[model samples]
Target chain A: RLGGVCGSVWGQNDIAYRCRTCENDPTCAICVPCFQNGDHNSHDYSIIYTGGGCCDCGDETAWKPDGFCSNHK
Target chain B: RLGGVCGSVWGQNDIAYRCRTCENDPTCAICVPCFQNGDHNSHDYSIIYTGGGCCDCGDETAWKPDGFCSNHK
Candidate 1:
């Protein structure tokens, strides 16, 4: 489950690092798919689109980076 | 490793943000196949060019946040 279209390249550089993508939580940065504080569409929007992110973790939940760049596998 | 392109909005807001992208690292956040101790094309520019990040996780190698979000597909 760690090799796919670009995994060959992803593994090359990420082999040494630990945090896979936004798996880690930090202050200076935040992950995508964050909460919308009850924006209605916030939950729905994120459900269909890659949510935004900051440099720090928002509300204790990390975010997911839009997978596969722009290529819809 | 995971789904390609878009895994259904990356799983409904990460379905709870339990470490999806960065893989649960900490210290202010930072992902994207990071590592430049020597800078050999930054390890081939992560073999793609998702480079340039700073929110934290620098020296320990924690960068490479560029899976999607620029219409690479």
Candidate 2:
């Protein structure tokens, strides 16, 4: 799946996109699909992998501004 | 350095340890030194990279049980 820990199609290994500006926590991440669907363009981010989990595409506290992709939202 | 994004001596790239049991987040991680030094034995964790930053060895919220190491504590 090109989703997240729940999925991944990141040609580059460990390139699962994570958000520093959005989640602001290093322990946060989203899959390529969710990441692309999200409104996190200008936000700085970390690309760490948590090994496994659904995309953190939406969460008010972790991502106050533009969290939640269309599917996640 | 054997630290974190702030450092790395994991020998293997992206082998930085993250505590899904502790921090419980995908974006969270600690350096080899911190990961080795901490009381994380037997705790499930992730090995990801945040690009760079100080080790998340000590934090009450993210790591409630056994977060810090001897140095971090």
Using DockQ, give the best candidate's number: 1
DockQ of 1: 0.04
Q: What fraction of the true interface contacts does model 1 reproduce?
A: 0.00
lDDT of 1 by residue, B1-73 (tens): 1111212222212211111243224322322222221122312222222233232332224323432211111
Candidate 2: tens digits of C-alpha lDDT, residues B1-73: 2321122222223356777777735555667777777677788876675453334555443344466666655
DockQ of each: 0.04, 0.02
Q: What CAPRI class is candidate 1?
A: incorrect
For each candidate, the alpha-carbon lDDT, in order, equals 0.24, 0.53
Residues forming the 10-long window of minimal summed lDDT in candidate 1 chain A: A9-18
lDDT of 2: 0.53
lDDT (10s digit) by residue, model 1, range A1-73 = 2211222112211221113343333211221222221122322222221122222222123224432222212
lDDT of 2 at B68: 61
lDDT of 2 at B4: 12
TM-score of 2: 0.36
